[PDB]
Design a protein around this ligand. Structure first.
Ligand SMILES: CCCCCCCC/C=C\CCCCCCCC(=O)O[C@H](COC(=O)CCCCCCCCCCCCCCC)COP(=O)(O)OCCN
Ligand SMILES: CCCCCCCC/C=C\CCCCCCCC(=O)O[C@H](COC(=O)CCCCCCCCCCCCCCC)COP(=O)(O)OCCN
Ligand SMILES: *[C@@H]1O[C@H](CO)[C@@H](O)[C@H](O)[C@H]1NC(C)=O
Ligand SMILES: *[C@@H]1O[C@H](CO)[C@@H](O)[C@H](O)[C@H]1NC(C)=O
Ligand SMILES: [Mg+2]
Ligand SMILES: [Mg+2]
Length: 1920
């Protein structure tokens, strides 16, 4: 058993060593597929980041001025590297380096603090007041130098130098100068609606016209448009509140403090607009004019005072600046809060407002009723906002933790730039202002927590989605190859011929599994090494990956085993295998979309498919990679997400279970659906059963004669045509005998012998073999059987010696005995010189000898030979005769022959069948006694060229010498007579033979040989008693019509192949689309009350700064102990889901003394207060840095409050260092015991802060301005008074001191708003009046987004884009598997000679290829129409939109037009169909998928500009492949529609045309050019480099060489061919000339070079030397006319397996140009005059062995060519059929044409052949006419005898011959016959002497020939 696997594996590895290219490709293909990933990985480095310390973010509780400053400066999240001054303990400004700050600092330190300056100013003011009442100088001069250095210092100097440019490039520069002016940051900085496909796309307002023009100027340009779209609602929007109760009115009246404060500046600018003209009037006409005149008069008045030490223009610019400001500020909408009454009405008005983009928010107070006016203690509200302006509500944090602070100022701060945090703060400030009478002014500053230096690997996003698909597409080639190999091996009968030799089924399955597993193991080892050392996966243990890949290889091998039991034709198993393998992977892509509602049970159930479990395992690999973990043998078994029972170990466990199930199911189905050549198939309950899985022509059984094989009432009916092939046999083959099985063609010989084996199931009767019935016990029978099939089936690239060694060892023989057996059986069959020639380079006869040879190796007790010698020369048949007669001791040999002398000699009991049933059977002597026995004399006639002599005088002579004589046959010089055998004169016959011998030339006879009754005459008795269209347009149209009809007639009968190659890919696309529409329905967004305890079990900290105040002390208390941190545990109940726990006393954690030693040892104080922990990445990646033991100082004291959370009082510590340096430890402590990471600190509140406020005190400013108004006569104004009336409340709410900071972590989405809510609860509860318990009161915010049917942009567009990309790659799959199906039929034709036979007819390469291209275009058009119809049906708007449908149609049709002529040249490489199919399909798959993946992933995630430069080039490099063109077209058609949908969502409706020359038009034009160029190229590939002698022979050579004759048709001249790598000419130096009236016969030993001569004569192979002129036109130069003057019948039949005989004749009569009116008669004649009358309407596949030769001969003869080359026309044909063919050929050569006939039956080439030529070793020996040959090379008579009873009885006759005929050699003494070459005087003496002693001896049969041709041929074969 192990030995048998050893042998099969050795054979497989030998055949694999013979072909190394396929091996290398099979080991390299997946590595080749895994190249774009390695290139991208080498393209994207790590790029570790830095600390990223973030600045403050003010809020409307902190006043207005810092609010706007923090809106303007912090609009980008600058990401500094060094800590901001905002994270200092009691400092919150964060703008200390601003130039205004420096100038103000200088102004304060110099001027105001200076006491003398204040005194001087007061003195000047008092003097001015005294002067006004009426209506010092040194001190003022003293402060004049004080002013100087104030300008000189670089603050004021810088202010002037930077205001001097004041602004070219306002968009570029104005914000630059403002940002350097207002704040002073030290240089901080830090699909997709991209223009990639953008370019292709292409109101009264009830407001002042100023703002009409303003909004249009904003709306018109995208640079101003996308910013305005997000900024508009805040400046112009509305706010809507439902309850309308006076309580809500009170809350919102208290909440307009910001908007009233913003309206105050509008009041002031209006006041200046009014009052300015008064200033101008005072400067123009006032007492100032007298003042100036006095100043002008100073040189005459105060010249000394003057010497001691534009107005319009400055007033002008100031007037302009204020007005330009005024026009903008005028139409801000600062009356926002607009009441309503119900939720539904609010939503209706929200729909009304959102279209114009005004809706800001809607505030709903659920607890309120319209008739309410008292605020409850615990008040709640909900801020209903849009969904593109508020973060998602159903989820609280992203599914997978990835490193990164999440600080993008656009896609993460939706709560800030959108306007949720601001409005929440205004409303909560309103509430805390309405409950308590007091205020407690405390502003709130956010602060984002800092971060360590991460690495941010940019590759893991790409490898996240394209890794499983590539790791699955890697193995599609191996899967297709394994399934195709299994099906092809079981289709070519190569598996049944193994089961006959003894091997079981278990061994075959085991070797298939072992070989496939070894190959997959090699490729997998290579793949894991390549991935590891390619740095694609960094941390993952390679051993785990290797084991995972082994598990998947086993699973996919068993899947291949299951798939191989479905199909039965390799042309049908090459497409379905790959498509079904990929179809079992789409469920994984569907499972990626849901990502939820995936119960582990359902995940396992879906994973019950192996390629889905592989996808799951790959997902877990990728997830564990992006965490720095990897699967180090402990990580296995636990998922990286929140809660999954699914894991990695269980993934490959399910894979192994899948492999087991598939293997068991394949094994079960194999024995119930065995296929075509299957044995009697067991019933479906094989496991259930306890048993393991004229009646006188027949001779009676003689005594003894034990039977070996019995057949009883056998019936076999091939269904489609009835007509049972084997009707009712009652045969019984015996033990020690060679039973010859004869019968006419299509009688039931091969079918009966196949039923005798297991190859076919009988449909009735029983077949006992050796006593063991055949359907029940077929294994014991086949342990001792050897068969030789009619069509030789044997491995190609195995040699001869290896064939015999394989088959001899496969039956128990030790290595050594196989050597002896092979040597002996090479000696016995004459194959010694061909020991090492491959079994495909052998000649036909040598293959036939090898088959019968390998049928006898080992000891088989039932040997079944089917045509053992059909195509073997008359000499090599003696070797086979001795071989049979030697192995007849106990074997029940059963030979089915068509040579009657063979069956008479060898057969010991013959049985003739006819029409299925047995006709007669018995010992041949008994048969000849039953039917008419007689004595036949077969006299030939010569020619002078009309056949010499006449049948009149010969007839008269024969009837004169014997009056009863009947003429039996007279076909072409044969003229066989029949004479009576009983009661003859003994003298009349002798006189007749004397008369014939003495006059052998007067009658023209040349030969005559008597014979006792042969078997052939008995068998004949049984059988009887049982013009051209002219060239040009007409002929080309006829050729096109004929070829199209042939293709159609072949297609319509094999409908399964047409479906599985055309319609199935469309079904695959349809299934992909049907899975595309199964997506979860959109559910509405929930309430999501915002509180910090959402995440649960977290760390929070607080830091009490500024501890001297009392209000902050009570604030810290009411935030710490009494009411708790947040809103939970407020003594009344809140969210019963979250309980009210108990607290823990103040506790400080322990620490190692190592830390304490470090902390009292060094002196790193107040900068770097903890060891600056290294965070490098280049050495080891370690995304989160490793940091020493003293990371963040000694741990701060902690406790657990009533709410479950850890409070860390980091009061007197560095905050930023603590969080930065203890983040990684906090993450790592979360990683363990859970294997999924999550941060445990989400924020805290740091009480304390200060904001330096200028001391204006309010009243001083208004008094100062009023004093200037009284003095300057500028006082007075309605609007001026109205604006200046509320000044103190304008300076109150500007800036707020004593603030609160709120540290928040953004990786939890709802952290900032929840902690803002907590802070406002603290400020309310701190501000409360006394005696009122703080616990009762609180606030809570609810965030329910607006109740619209809409998804967020960040999710809906990616879903649709990914879906369309997947659909595109599925379409590429489908349309790449189709065009490879057009090479199956081309190779099927080329491997046969059907293409060459059509070329021998009128068809010329251009017409053939053009017609094939037309048919392929039609079929592809059908498939593309199916795909397009599917897209129309599913309403995929991206492709089937009325603007994008022509693009799709053109794309698909031109891809079909452009890829087919690319597949045509590949039909010249592969020599087996279904291997070209697999290879071409896999190549197309790889090219198209890779090109589309590149144009997709690189475009979406390759920001690097260096990659883009290479990519741009590669587009133009890859334009050459039409697959790339189709991929780009489809992906761009998806992306353009995605972008258009994004645009139309906002309301622009941008429409694009697809045919832009940059979009897809280049692809279309390139496809056209590619199609034309490739068709010309395939035509070129077709046209160019397509993939001392005797005396008579010497005389003919001189005749040809010196002067060539002018009457010959065929004139060979020094023909020669040396086969490549042989070093000995197969055919060398032939010179013959065939006249137009003779049948030149080319006899020859096997492997002498006969078929090669025909091959080079027609034009198949390549001549090596010399011409061969056919009717004038040479071969080497021009072959078209040679083909026009020739008809060829190949040795091996070249027919189409699915066209009847009639349609074959119709095709080949149309091709030769017979007119369409005279084709019925030609077909009828060729059908009637060659047999074929019954089988003229059955497919050429359902033909018998000889009925294919009949068809080939009929094909060769249509069209009347004047030179017909028949290459063995009669091999395996009935005597009657070959008689009719002789009649045809004789008619031919009598009509006036010539035929070159090759045959191995010497009766033939003696009857109808005019001139012979025996060819040995590639050169002639005789080349003479029949008479002259039998004269020069022969003498004497041949007395052949047959004695009856064995070998020791042969002695008396030898003594008789030696005593009578003195000189008489002995030739060919077989087991029972003798053949002496007597040299007597005359034949009458031999006849009389042999007949008179016939009774004394035991002569059964006899024959006295006269130097037959067999003697000549056997002499030649013996010599060489
Ligand atoms: C769709 C057309 C594909 C098709 O019809 O293929 C047919 C069989 O294909 C199948 O059975 C597909 C099986 C689908 C299984 C679903 C998993 C014909 O194959 P066959 O070799 O002629 O039958 C031999 C008997 N086992
Ligand atoms: C890459 C190099 C591909 C070279 C493939 C050449 C080749 O023919 O290999 C053939 C198979 O080659 C392959 O499998 C690789 C496929 C190459 C894709 C072609 C584009 C063997 O087929 P065959 O019919 O047994 O050949 C017998 C006589 N040629
Ligand atoms: C809001 O949507 C919810 C479903 O999530 C529905 O119950 C409710 O009636 C809707 N309210 C309005 C005002 O449309
Ligand atoms: C503290 O721990 C370190 C860690 O190995 C050790 O080497 C050292 O000896 C300990 N004692 C000190 C630093 O005093
Ligand atoms: Mg047969
Ligand atoms: Mg041959």
């Amino acid at each position: 058993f192990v030995r048998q696997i050893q042998l099969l594996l050795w054979k497989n590895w030998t055949l694999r060593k013979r072909q190394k290219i396929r091996f290398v490709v099979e080991l390299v293909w997946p590595l080749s597929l895994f190249l774009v990933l390695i290139w991208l990985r080498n393209a994207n480095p790590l790029y570790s980041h830095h600390e990223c310390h973030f600045p403050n973010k003010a809020m409307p509780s902190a006043g207005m001025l810092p609010w706007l400053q923090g809106i303007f400066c912090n609009v980008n999240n600058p990401c500094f590297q060094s800590p901001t001054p905002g994270e200092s303990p009691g400092i919150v400004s964060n703008y200390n380096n601003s130039i205004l700050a420096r100038v103000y600092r200088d102004f304060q330190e110099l001027l105001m603090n200076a006491p003398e300056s204040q005194h001087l100013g007061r003195i000047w003011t008092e003097l001015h007041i005294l002067s006004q009442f009426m209506d010092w100088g040194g001190i003022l001069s003293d402060m004049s130098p004080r002013i100087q250095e104030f300008i000189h210092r670089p603050s004021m100097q810088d202010l002037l130098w930077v205001t001097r440019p004041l602004g070219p490039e306002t968009f570029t520069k104005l914000m630059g100068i403002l940002s350097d002016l207002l704040c002073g940051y030290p240089e901080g900085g830090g699909w997709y609606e991209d223009n990639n496909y953008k370019a292709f796309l292409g109101y009264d307002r009830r407001t002042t016209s100023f703002c009409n023009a303003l909004i249009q100027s904003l709306e018109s340009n995208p640079l101003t448009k996308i910013a305005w779209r997000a900024a508009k609602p805040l400046l112009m929007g509305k706010i809507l509140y439902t309850p309308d109760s006076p309580a809500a009115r009170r809350i919102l009246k208290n909440a307009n403090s910001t908007f009233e404060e913003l309206e105050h500046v509008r009041k002031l600018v209006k006041a200046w607009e009014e009052v300015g003209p008064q200033i101008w009037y005072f400067f123009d006409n006032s007492t100032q004019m007298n003042m100036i005149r006095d100043t002008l008069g100073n040189p005459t008045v105060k010249d000394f005072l003057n010497r001691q030490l534009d107005w319009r223009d400055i007033f002008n610019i100031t007037d302009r600046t204020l007005r330009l400001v005024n026009q903008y500020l005028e139409c801000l909408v600062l009356d926002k809060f607009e009441s309503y009454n119900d939720e539904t009405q609010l939503t209706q008005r929200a729909l009304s407002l959102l279209e114009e983009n005004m809706f800001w928010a809607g505030v709903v107070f659920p607890d309120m009723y319209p008739w309410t006016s008292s605020l409850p203690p615990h008040v709640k509200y909900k801020i209903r906002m849009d969904i593109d302006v508020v973060e998602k509500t159903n989820k609280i944090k992203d599914r997978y933790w990835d490193s990164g602070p999440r600080a993008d100022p656009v896609e993460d701060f939706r709560y800030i730039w959108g306007g949720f945090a601001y409005l929440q703060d205004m409303v909560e400030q309103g509430i805390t202002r309405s409950q308590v009478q007091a205020e407690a002014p405390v502003g709130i500053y956010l602060q984002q927590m800092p971060y360590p230096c991460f690495v941010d690997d940019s590759f893991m996003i790409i490898l996240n989605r394209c890794f499983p698909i590539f790791m699955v597409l890697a193995w599609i080639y191996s899967v297709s190859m394994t399934v195709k190999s299994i099906v092809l091996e079981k289709e070519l009968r190569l598996k049944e011929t193994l089961k006959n030799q003894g091997v079981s089924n278990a061994v075959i399955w085991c070797t298939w599994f072992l070989d496939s597993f070894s190959i997959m193991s090699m490729s997998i080892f290579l793949l894991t090494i390549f991935i590891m050392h390619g740095r694609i996966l960094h941390y993952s243990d390679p051993f785990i990956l290797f084991l995972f890949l082994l598990a998947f290889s086993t699973a996919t091998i068993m899947l291949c085993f299951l798939l191989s039991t479905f199909f039965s034709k390799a042309s049908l198993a090459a497409a379905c295998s790959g498509v079904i393998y990929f179809t079992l992977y789409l469920p994984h892509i569907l499972c990626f979309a849901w990502q939820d509602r995936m119960t582990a049970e359902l995940k396992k159930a879906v994973s019950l498919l192996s390629p889905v479990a592989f996808g799951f395992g790959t997902e877990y690999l990728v997830r564990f990679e992006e965490q720095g973990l990897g699967l180090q043998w402990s990580n296995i078994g636990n998922s990286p997400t929140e809660g999954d029972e699914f894991s990695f170990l269980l993934s490959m466990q399910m894979m192994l279970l899948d492999a087991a199930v598939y293997g068991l199911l394949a094994w079960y189905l194999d024995q119930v659906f065995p296929g075509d050549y299957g044995t009697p198939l067991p019933w479906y309950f094989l496991l259930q059963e306890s048993y393991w899985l004229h009646d006188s022509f027949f001779e009676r059984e003689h005594p003894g004669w034990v039977p070996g094989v019995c057949v009883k009432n056998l019936v076999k009916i091939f269904e489609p045509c009835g007509r049972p092939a084997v009707d009712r046999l009652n045969i019984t083959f015996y033990e020690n005998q060679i039973t010859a099985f004869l019968g006419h063609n299509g009688a039931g010989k091969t079918t009966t012998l196949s039923i005798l084996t297991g190859l076919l199931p009988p449909t009735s009767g029983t077949v006992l073999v050796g006593g063991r019935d055949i359907e029940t016990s077929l294994d014991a029978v086949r342990q001792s059987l050897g068969m030789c099939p009619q069509h030789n089936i044997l491995f190609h690239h195995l040699t001869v010696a290896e064939h015999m060694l394989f088959y001899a060892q496969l039956k128990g023989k030790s290595q050594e005995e196989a050597q002896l057996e092979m040597e002996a059986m090479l000696e016995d069959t004459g194959l010694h010189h061909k020991r090492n020639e491959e079994a495909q380079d052998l000649s036909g006869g040598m293959q036939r000898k090898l088959s019968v040879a390998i049928a006898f190796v080992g000891d088989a007790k039932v040997v079944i030979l089917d045509q053992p010698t059909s195509g073997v020369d008359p000499y090599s048949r003696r070797s086979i005769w001795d071989l049979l007669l030697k192995y007849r001791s106990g074997r029940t040999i059963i030979m089915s022959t068509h040579h009657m002398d063979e069956a008479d000699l060898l057969g010991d009991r013959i049985a003739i069948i006819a029409q299925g049933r047995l006709y007669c059977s018995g010992t041949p002597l008994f048969l000849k006694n039953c039917f008419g026995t007689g004595l036949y004399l077969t006299l030939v006639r010569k020619m002078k060229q009309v056949l010499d002599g006449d049948v009149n005088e010969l007839m008269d002579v024969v009837l004169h010498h014997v009056p009863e004589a009947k003429l039996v046959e007279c076909i072409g010089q044969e003229l066989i007579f029949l004479l009576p055998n009983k009661n003859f004169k003994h003298r009349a016959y002798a006189s007749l033979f004397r008369e014939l011998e003495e006059t052998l030339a007067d009658l023209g006879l040349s030969s005559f040989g008597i014979s006792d009754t042969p078997l052939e005459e008995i068998f004949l008795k049984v059988t009887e008693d049982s013009p051209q269209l002219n060239t040009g347009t007409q002929l080309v149209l006829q050729h096109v019509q004929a070829l199209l009809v042939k293709r159609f007639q072949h297609t319509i009968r094999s409908h399964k192949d047409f479906l599985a190659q055309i319609v199935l890919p469309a079904t695959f696309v349809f299934l992909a689309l049907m899975l595309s529409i199964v997506i979860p329905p959109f559910g509405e967004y929930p309430a999501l009350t915002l509180h910090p305890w959402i995440y649960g079990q977290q760390y929070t900290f607080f830091s009490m700064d500024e501890p001297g105040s009392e209000q902050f002390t009570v604030l810290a208390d009411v935030l710490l102990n009494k009411p708790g941190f947040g809103n939970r545990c407020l003594k009344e109940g809140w969210l019963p889901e979250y309980p009210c726990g108990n607290s823990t006393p103040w506790k400080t954690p322990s620490v190692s003394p190592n830390i304490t030693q470090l902390f009292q040892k060094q002196k790193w104080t107040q900068v770097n207060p903890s060891p600056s922990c290294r965070c490098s990445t280049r050495e080891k990646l370690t995304m989160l840095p490793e940091c020493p033991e003293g990371a963040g100082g000694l741990p701060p004291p902690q406790r657990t409050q009533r709410s479950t959370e850890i409070l860390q009082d980091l009061t007197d510590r560095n905050i930023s260092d603590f969080l930065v340096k203890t983040y990684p430890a906090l993450i790592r402590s979360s990683l363990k015991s859970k294997f999924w990471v999550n941060e445990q600190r989400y924020g805290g509140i740091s009480i304390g802060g200060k904001l330096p406020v200028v001391p204006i005190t309010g009243e001083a400013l208004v008094g100062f301005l009023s004093d200037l108004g009284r003095i300057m006569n500028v006082s007075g104004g309605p609007i001026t008074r109205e604006a200046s009336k509320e000044i103190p409340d304008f300076l109150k709410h500007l800036e707020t001191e004593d603030n609160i900071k709120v540290w928040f972590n953004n990786k939890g989405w709802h952290a900032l708003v929840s902690f803002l809510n907590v802070a406002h609860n603290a400020i309310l509860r701190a501000s409360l009046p006394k005696d009122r318990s703080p616990e009762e009161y609180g606030i809570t915010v609810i965030s329910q987004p607006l109740n619209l049917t809409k998804e967020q942009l960040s999710e809906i567009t990616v879903l649709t884009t990914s879906v369309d990309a997947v659909v595109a790659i599925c379409v590429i799959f489908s349309m790449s598997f189709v065009p490879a199906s057009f090479v199956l039929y081309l190779i099927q034709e080329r491997v046969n000679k059907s293409k060459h036979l059509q070329f021998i007819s009128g068809v010329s390469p251009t017409t053939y290829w053009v017609t094939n291209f037309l048919w392929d275009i039609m079929n592809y058009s059908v498939s593309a129409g199916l795909v397009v119809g599917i897209f129309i049906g599913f309403q995929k708007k991206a492709y089937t939109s009325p603007e994008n449908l022509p693009a799709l149609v053109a794309l698909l049709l031109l891809y079909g037009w452009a890829v087919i002529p690319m597949m045509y040249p590949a039909s010249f490489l592969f020599d087996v169909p279904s291997t070209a199919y697999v290879a071409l399909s896999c190549a197309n798959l790889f090219i198209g998928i890779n090109s589309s993946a590149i144009t997709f992933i690189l475009e979406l995630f390759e920001n690097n500009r260096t990659l883009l430069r290479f990519n741009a080039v590669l587009r133009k490099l890859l334009i050459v492949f039409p697959h790339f063109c189709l991929g780009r077209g489809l992906i761009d058609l998806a992306l353009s529609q995605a972008v258009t949908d994004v645009y139309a969502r906002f309301g622009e409706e941008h429409s694009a045309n697809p045919f832009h020359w940059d979009l897809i038009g280049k692809n279309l034009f390139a496809m056209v050019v590619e199609g034309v160029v490739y068709f010309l190229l395939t035509l070129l590939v077709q046209r160019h480099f397509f993939l001392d002698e005797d005396d008579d022979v010497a005389e003919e050579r001189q005749r040809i060489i010196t002067g060539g004759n002018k009457t010959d048709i065929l004139r060979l001249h020094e023909l020669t061919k040396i086969y490549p790598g042989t070093s000995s000419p197969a055919v060398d130096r032939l010179c013959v000339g065939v006249r137009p009236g003779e049948c030149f016969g080319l006899l020859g030993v096997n492997g002498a070079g006969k078929t090669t001569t025909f091959k080079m004569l027609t034009g198949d192979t390549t001549v090596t030397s010399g011409d061969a002129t056919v009717a004038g036109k040479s071969i080497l130069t021009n072959i078209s006319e040679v083909h026009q003057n020739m008809g060829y019948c190949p040795q091996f039949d070249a027919i189409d397996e699915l066209l009847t005989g009639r349609e074959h004749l119709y095709l080949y009569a149309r091709l030769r140009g017979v007119p369409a009116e005279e084709i019925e008669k030609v077909a009828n004649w060729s059908i009637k005059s060659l047999g074929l009358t019954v089988y003229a309407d059955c497919l050429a596949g359902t033909y018998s062995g000889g009925n294919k030769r009949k068809l080939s001969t009929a094909i060769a003869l249509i069209g009347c060519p004047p030179l017909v080359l028949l290459d063995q026309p009669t091999t395996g044909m009935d005597p009657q059929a070959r008689r009719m063919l002789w009649n045809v050929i004789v008619s031919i050569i009598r009509e006036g044409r010539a035929v070159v006939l090759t045959s191995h039956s010497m009766e033939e080439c003696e009857a109808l052949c005019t001139r012979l030529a025996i060819m040995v070793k590639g050169a002639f020996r005789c080349m003479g006419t029949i008479q002259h040959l039998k004269s020069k090379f022969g003498d004497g008579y041949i007395v052949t005898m047959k004695i009856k009873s064995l070998l020791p009885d042969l002695n008396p006759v030898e003594q008789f011959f030696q005593g009578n005929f003195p000189g008489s050699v002995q030739r060919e003494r077989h087991y029972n016959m003798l053949q002496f070459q007597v040299s007597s005087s005359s034949l009458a003496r031999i006849f009389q002497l042999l007949l008179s002693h016939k009774d004394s001896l035991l002569i059964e049969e006899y024959s006295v020939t006269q130097t037959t041709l067999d003697q000549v041929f056997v002499n030649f074969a013996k010599q060489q």
